[PDB]
Amino acid sequence: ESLRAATHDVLAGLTAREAKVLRMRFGIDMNTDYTLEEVGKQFDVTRERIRQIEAKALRKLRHPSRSEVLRSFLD
DNA sequence: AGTGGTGGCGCATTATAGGGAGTTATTCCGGCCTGACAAGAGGAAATTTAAAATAATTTTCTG
C-alpha cells in the first residue's frame, strides 16, 4: 500500500504524458499492460520513440533524492 | 519265464507372459512479434567573448 501511494505521488511529480506512458507500459493503477506498439498507437506516434520516452523517463528518475525514498523499498 | 510296472516321451490340456494396438498426456521444434542498437535531421537553450558604461585611482590644476 505504501509503495503504491509513493509511486503514485512521484509519478505525479513527473510530466503528464511521460507519466501516462509509464503507467501504460506497466500495470500501474491500470489493467493489462499493452506492448509498446499499442501505446504508441495510443499517442499515434508508434515506433522506437516510445521506448526513447521510456528510457528518458527512467534516466530522469535515476537522479537521487527522489527515488531514495523508494530505494527504501528494496531489501 | 511272463505279465505287469516304470520311466520317458507324446498328446492333450492348462497357464503365464509379452507384444501390439490403442489412447492420453507430457514434451520438443519452429515462426513471428517485441526489444534493443545505430544513425540521421531540424530547431532551440546555454556559454563565451567583445564592446560600452558607473564607480574608484591617478594626475593635474587652482586656491
Side-chain angles (χ1 to χ4, degrees):
Chain A
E1 279 304 329
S2 46
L3 190 142
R4 276 164 161 171
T7 193
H8 174 86
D9 62 62
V10 163
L11 277 187
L14 299 203
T15 69
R17 78 181 185 179
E18 274 172 346
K20 183 56 65 66
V21 162
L22 293 176
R23 278 161 208 273
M24 186 60 244
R25 176 70 163 170
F26 296 135
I28 316 164
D29 74 13
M30 183 278 288
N31 296 320
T32 182
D33 74 322
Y34 293 166
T35 180
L36 70 85
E37 292 94 337
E38 197 63 33
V39 67
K41 188 269 182 182
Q42 201 295 320
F43 278 165
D44 306 327
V45 168
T46 303
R47 194 55 282 173
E48 299 286 311
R49 170 61 184 288
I50 202 69
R51 97 192 63 208
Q52 295 280 335
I53 295 180
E54 191 176 282
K56 189 65 182 294
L58 267 295
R59 195 185 166 266
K60 179 170 103 164
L61 53 84
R62 308 293 193 180
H63 295 83
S65 71
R66 282 85 71 197
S67 63
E68 316 321 311
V69 56
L70 304 96
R71 177 68 48 76
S72 43
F73 290 96
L74 291 185
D75 50 338

